Amino acid sequence: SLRPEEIEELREAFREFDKDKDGYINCRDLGNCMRTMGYMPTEMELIELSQQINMNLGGHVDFDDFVELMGPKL
Ligand SMILES: [Ca+2]
Prior knowledge:
mainly alpha
């Protein structure tokens, strides 16, 4: 039932990808994070998804959504 240990790592990543350090990000470097250690989405997966988030969501992702989307492992 690991979570806080795995999440703690995401916190560092979120900031690492956060260049504006404004406490927010988008489907820009987000996809680059999934391939870093996530699940490495396919070709259209990293696109269809990134966009889906860009459109559906609104065009922004918070450390919460990033963590939630990242999930534990699967
Ligand atoms: Ca930010």
